[PDB]
Design a protein around this ligand. Structure first.
Ligand SMILES: [Zn+2]
Lengths: 177, 131, 101, 147, 69, 305
């Protein structure tokens, strides 16, 4: 839930400074790079992909953050803060296969944007994923709450007339990003 | 490898109260002291009195699965083959011995000279019969 | 799609997938018996049977174990396909005999 | 019952499962009746044979391996009694197979010498079907009965 | 009460067969099993339906609250 | 085994086909599949029957629900292909359409007859409209149906079914909605006055039987089953197909030793009677098709873990 809050917040909160954002990206890629380095070995071992809920959760948040704020992560040179080009690919091809277990609509939007930015190419991994589907296992008794939890974004737009107007100064609508 | 064979001649074929199984009593033609009692699915292998049956007990054939392309085994040499367990041995006299087999309930009792039945152990075994 | 029709019973399916149990909703002996007949003709199948937990829950349990050439899910598919083809053969034969009658 | 203490008691003290023996004399109160006895005399008869197809089907229809009795997560079967001319299993093997799939695997099979209600004379000359023999968990002789 | 419409077991329509069955016994002076056959009732399922029907309704009908006896 | 090996060996024999009943053999098919067709024909081949009955008045001696029930048992001569299925998740207004439903009405009042031949027992001459028949269900076409069903009005397959009886002053007034359904749901939807099979007789004689035994032996089976040959004087089987398998032979001690009674074992003799809506052959075709779709619908469903 926090990770959803975290990702939604960074994306939406207009008054955030470039560096506070890079701060959150730098925390997430850092925490993520460690997860894959210390844990990838546990996947072909006994258990399910649920053992790694928390991994996907964080990777979602980071992907989500990239959707709304990718234009910021290019420094003066045109290089990527946090080596996002090199970093995303590594996770996408990892054994966790984030693309399969995270929210479907975000993973899709990240694909679109990431591909556009020469940052990562996920679209073949997606193809492979829903092909294997028609023909990496997780119960579904508990797999749904997760899909549920990953669908909720606490700072998706408001629908209260006044509050909305009041928030405008503090909000980034998707159209803006 | 093979543990026992002999040609037996059937004395009696009793259908009891069943209609697929018969109890066979038969004596060896080679040993005066070797006799046999055996339940047989006679629907798959009919037997009449005075028939002569060759009877082989073997430890293996040279786990079970339906026959495939080009499988060959000791079973090929015979008409009727059963798999079962030895479950009792007994002294009948100073000279003779009897071993008891069960083939999922169809019972065999083989009595004979203790040297003639030397190779029989209390293990599992295949039974092979041909006419 | 429809995801609620057939499911894997992961507590009786092996790691190598050469053995598995499936629970199919809304099916009794009709399909169950016919499907096991077909599946058992597949030479790589080592074991197969179906069962009906209870007459009051519409459920059908199929078990498949293979000798290791194909997975259990493969055998289910070949069986299902084999069954479809088998019906075609019957329909066509019946048609011809009605015409020729 | 409406609270966990009462739950625990109904599942561990007053539950059916323990109460196999009566406290009066310490003898069984639970068993099968009617159809099931008649059926047993027939299924375990020497005249009873089953093809691979039938044998496997009787097994799975009664085991319910999708239960708490994952003694294995794969059903075990015996080799057939008759190998040739045709693969056949006996009824007594269905029983052995049942026990084999529901007793603990890290534990030797049951050993019992008992008797049933039907005299040997009823089956024919030389029968021993009145004697019930279990060796290492396998029914090697005798039919199963009300007894 | 009145003829059943279908045979309980067969599913076969039987309700068109009561009035004729009576006329067969009455007019043509047949026995019951011959008459049942002539109406096409082959399975004992179906023969039972007409053979043993009791037209109890004809009793109920004699009490009609809507006419001056 | 192999589907081609099956094709080469499978065979159909059609003894008698008629608008109401079929008698035919399926040869060299497995019992599991014959049984499937049989089950499907009885319980899964859709049919049209009255499902909802709307009473406006019934002052007959027969109670509403009972009257409704019998109307539901009336086999309607309607091609089920001419109708689509009702979706039972919509409200009543949206539920019933011109592709969904067929409407029948029934409207009888019984009056006393003045011109009754004095001293009469017959209710036809004593009362007007004493007896109500299935044929009295009037087909009221709705919307497009005036066109679609113009070439085939909706009529009960058995017009002379007795539905109700009345006496002077009593009236029945109802509309019925008739829809698609299957026998497995309720037997009123079953399209058969029964589909069943028997396995073919095999009477095989285990040694010659002649003379006075032959005549004796022959009389243990229906006329024509067992023949006595001229010459060898021995008995032989003419056609087992006429045998009823009474096992009468097995009673007489002298024969019980010399005859085995079996079947040509898969060999299935099917008898299919239609309730009146579709022909037998259509009902059997529809079942062979239904089985195939089950297999096809399943092959294409994704297996969820
Ligand atoms: Zn009937």
């Amino acid at each position: 839930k926090s990770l959803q809050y975290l990702g939604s917040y960074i994306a939406r909160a207009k008054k955030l400074s470039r560096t506070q954002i890079i701060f959150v990206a730098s925390y997430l890629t850092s925490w993520l790079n460690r997860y894959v380095i210390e844990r990838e070995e546990e996947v072909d071992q006994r258990g399910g992909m649920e053992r790694f809920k928390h991994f996907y959760a964080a990777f979602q948040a980071l992907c989500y953050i990239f959707c709304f704020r990718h234009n910021i992560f290019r420094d003066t040179d045109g290089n990527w803060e946090c080596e996002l080009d090199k970093f995303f690919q590594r996770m996408v091809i990892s054994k966790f296969n984030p693309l399969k277990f995270c929210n479907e609509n975000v993973m899709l939007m990240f694909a679109r944007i990431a591909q556009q930015e020469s940052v990562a190419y996920c679209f073949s991994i997606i193809e492979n994923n829903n092909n294997e589907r028609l023909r990496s296992s997780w119960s579904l008794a508990t797999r749904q709450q997760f899909i549920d939890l990953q669908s909720y974004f606490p700072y998706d737009p408001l629908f209260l007339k006044n509050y909305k107007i009041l928030m405008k100064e503090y909000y980034i609508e998707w159209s803006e990003a | 490898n093979t543990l026992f064979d002999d040609i037996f001649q059937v004395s009696e074929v009793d259908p009891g109260r069943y209609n697929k199984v018969c109890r066979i009593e038969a004596a060896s033609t080679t040993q005066d002291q070797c006799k046999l009692t055996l339940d047989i699915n006679v629907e798959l292998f009919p037997v009449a009195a005075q028939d002569s049956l060759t009877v082989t007990i073997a430890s293996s054939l040279n786990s079970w699965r339906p026959p495939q392309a080009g499988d060959r085994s000791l079973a090929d040499d015979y008409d009727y083959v059963m798999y079962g367990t030895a479950y009792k041995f007994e002294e009948v006299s100073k000279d003779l011995i009897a071993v008891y087999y069960s083939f999922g309930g169809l019972l065999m009792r083989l009595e004979g000279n203790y040297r003639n039945l030397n190779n029989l152990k209390q293990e599992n075994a295949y039974l092979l019969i041909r006419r | 799609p429809d995801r609620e029709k057939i499911k894997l019973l992961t507590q009786a399916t092996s790691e190598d997938g050469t053995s598995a149990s499936f629970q199919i909703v809304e099916e009794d002996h009709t399909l169950g018996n016919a499907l096991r007949y077909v599946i058992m003709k597949n030479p790589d199948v080592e074991f197969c049977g179906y069962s009906i937990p209870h007459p009051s829950e519409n459920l059908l349990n199929i078990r498949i174990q293979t000798y290791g050439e194909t997975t259990a899910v493969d055998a289910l598919q070949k069986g299902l396909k084999d069954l479809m083809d088998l019906c075609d053969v019957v329909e066509s034969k019946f048609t011809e005999k009605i015409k020729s009658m | 019952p409406q609270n966990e203490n009462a739950r625990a008691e109904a599942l561990n003290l007053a539950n059916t499962d323990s109460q196999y023996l009566t406290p009066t004399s310490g003898s069984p109160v639970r068993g099968l009746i009617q159809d099931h006895i008649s059926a047993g005399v027939w299924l375990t008869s020497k005249d009873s044979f089953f093809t691979r197809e039938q044998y496997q089907q009787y097994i799975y229809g009664c085991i319910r391996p999708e239960d708490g009795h994952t003694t294995r997560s794969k059903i075990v079967t015996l080799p057939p009694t008759i190998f040739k001319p045709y693969p056949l299993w006996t009824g007594k093997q269905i029983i052995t197979t049942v026990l084999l799939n529901v007793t603990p695997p890290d534990m030797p099979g049951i050993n019992l010498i008992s008797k049933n209600k039907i005299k040997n004379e009823y089956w024919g000359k030389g029968s021993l079907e009145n004697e019930v023999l279990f060796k290492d968990g396998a029914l090697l002789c005798g039919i199963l009965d009300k007894s | 009460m009145i003829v059943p419409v279908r045979c309980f077991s067969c599913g076969k329509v039987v309700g068109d067969k009561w009035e004729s069955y009576l006329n067969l016994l009455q007019e043509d002076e047949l026995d019951e099993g011959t008459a049942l056959s002539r109406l096409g009732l082959k399975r004992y399922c179906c023969r039972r339906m007409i053979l043993t029907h009791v037209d109890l309704i004809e009793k109920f009908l004699r009490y009609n609250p809507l006419e001056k006896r | 085994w192999n589907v081609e090996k099956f094709k080469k060996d499978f065979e159909v024999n059609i003894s008698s086909l008629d608008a109401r009943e079929a008698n035919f053999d399926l040869i060299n098919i497995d019992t599991s599949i014959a049984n499937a067709f049989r089950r499907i024909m009885i319980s899964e081949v859709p049919s049209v029957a009255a499902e909802y009955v709307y009473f406006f008045n019934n002052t007959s001696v027969i109670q509403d629900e009972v009257l409704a029930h019998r109307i539901g048992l009336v086999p309607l001569k309607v091609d089920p292909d001419m109708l689509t299925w009702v979706d039972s998740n919509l409200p009543d207004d949206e539920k019933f359409t011109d592709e969904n439903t067929i409407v029948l009405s029934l409207n009888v009042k019984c009056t006393r007859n003045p011109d009754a031949p004095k001293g009469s027992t017959d209710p036809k001459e004593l009362y007007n409209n004493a007896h109500v028949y299935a044929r009295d269900l009037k087909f009221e076409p709705q919307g497009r149906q005036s066109t679609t069903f113009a070439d085939c009005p909706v009529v009960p397959a058995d017009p002379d079914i007795l539905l109700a009886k009345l006496r002077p002053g009593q009236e029945i007034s109802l509309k019925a909605h008739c829809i698609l359904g299957i026998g497995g749901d309720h037997a009123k939807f079953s399209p058969v006055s029964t589909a069943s099979y028997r396995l073919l007789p095999q009477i095989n004689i285990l040694q010659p039987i002649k003379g006075e035994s032959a005549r004796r032996f022959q009389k243990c089976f229906p006329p024509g089953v067992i023949g006595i040959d001229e010459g060898s004087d021995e008995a032989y089987v003419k056609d087992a197909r006429k045998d009823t398998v009474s096992r009468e032979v097995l009673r007489y001690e002298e024969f019980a030793d010399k005859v085995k009674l079996g079947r040509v074992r898969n060999h299935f003799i099917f008898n299919v009677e239609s309730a009146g809506a579709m022909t037998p052959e259509e009902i059997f075709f529809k079942s062979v098709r239904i089985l195939k779709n089950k297999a096809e619908y399943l092959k294409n469903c994704p297996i969820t873990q």
